Design a binder for this molecule. Structure first.
Ligand SMILES: O=C(O)CNC(=O)C(=O)O
Ligand SMILES: [Mg+2]
Ligand code: NI
Ligand SMILES: [Zn+2]
Length: 331
């Protein structure tokens, strides 16, 4: 069995190996990459996402979110307070202001310590889930707006044509902006490209151990758990590496830098934080190996998680018994 310790693997494809996305994902899995839940892909030196980032300041962040924490330093929830619209240029200036800028630090480990010690005492502002792309249309390899769609994949594997579309999203981050512990909708893959700026630190639990994380989360968030059997789908719960280690949960950590891709694999729970002003682009995708995970994915039926249009068909076709209850939670 390849990668039996479930370590995060890092790949360096050549330009020839960068031509066929599906083939290279399947190659990574042949080496056991999926067992970690997360892999890093460093693109060939010949590749670029676009020519420059000099012309992005006029992108609008229609609904910036202030991430307000409740709890203790290693175990907290966050809610998202809506703020007034601002441009990427205005947000960048805000990120770099004294109130929000990254503090002086020695290295990534020192910044991680500072994050976990101090995150709860501040409320950083995040631009999330902005439909759009920063890939040049003439970038032909690993262009996140030109991947095969999940609806086409389900049709190819299972024979059923379904409605829906699959497009990328942009994320504008600052110091302390946080992504809570979650798997993807319908336990899909994700791919994330850090276009510019400061790093992103990731934490991940191997898919084969995901239920260990869920059990700890029910213990640490007992009211949330009573409310919803799939409350991690709400994307609000944080648990520090120190707390995970105290509870014997298997996990790994890695820092993504500008110009690097990350792939999350089906049922790989992940969380993390941004180091300073940055911009990432991400999209969900599927492969033949996803289908069996999609059929078994938990679902939030309490009202809180309330998802993409295009999730309807995946629940309807892969999870017909759950469909009626799930849909009641969407109305
Ligand atoms: O860029 C982000 O905010 C974090 N993205 C994800 O959780 C992802 O790509 O799966
Ligand atoms: Mg612009
Ligand atoms: Ni994710
Ligand atoms: Zn719920």
């Amino acid at each position: 069995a390849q990668n039996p310790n479930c370590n995060i693997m890092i790949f360096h494809p050549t330009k020839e190996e960068f031509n066929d996305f599906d083939k290279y994902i399947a190659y990574m899995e042949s080496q056991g990459a999926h067992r970690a839940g997360l892999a890093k892909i460093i693109p060939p030196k010949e590749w670029k996402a676009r020519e420059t980032y000099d012309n992005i300041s006029e992108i609008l962040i229609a609904t910036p979110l202030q991430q307000v924490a409740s709890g203790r330093a290693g175990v907290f929830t966050q809610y998202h307070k809506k703020k007034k619209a601002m441009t990427v240029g205005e947000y960048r200036h805000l990120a770099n202001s004294k109130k929000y800028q990254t503090p002086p630090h020695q290295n990534f480990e020192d910044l991680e310590r500072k994050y976990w010690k101090n995150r709860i005492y501040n409320s950083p502002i995040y631009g999330a889930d902005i439909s759009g792309s920063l890939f040049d249309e003439n970038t032909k390899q690993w262009n996140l707006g030109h991947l095969g769609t999940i609806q086409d994949l389900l049709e190819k594997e299972c024979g059923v044509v379904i409605e829906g579309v699959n497009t990328p999203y942009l994320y504008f981050g600052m110091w302390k902006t946080t992504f809570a512990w979650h798997t993807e909708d319908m336990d899909l893959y994700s791919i994330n490209y850090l276009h510019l700026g400061e790093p992103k630190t990731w934490y991940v639990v191997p898919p084969e151990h995901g239920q260990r994380l869920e059990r700890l989360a029910r213990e640490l968030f007992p009211g949330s758990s009573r409310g919803c059997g799939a409350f991690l789908r709400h994307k609000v719960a944080l648990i520090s590496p120190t707390v995970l280690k105290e509870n014997g949960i298997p996990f790994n950590r890695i820092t993504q830098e500008a110009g690097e891709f990350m792939v999350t694999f089906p049922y790989g729970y992940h969380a993390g934080f941004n180091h300073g002003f940055n911009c990432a682009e991400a999209i969900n995708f599927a492969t033949p190996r996803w289908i069996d995970y999609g059929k078994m994915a938990s679902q939030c039926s309490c009202g809180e998680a309330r998802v993409t249009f295009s999730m309807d068909a995946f629940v309807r076709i892969l999870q017909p018994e759950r469909y009626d209850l799930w849909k009641r939670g969407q109305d």
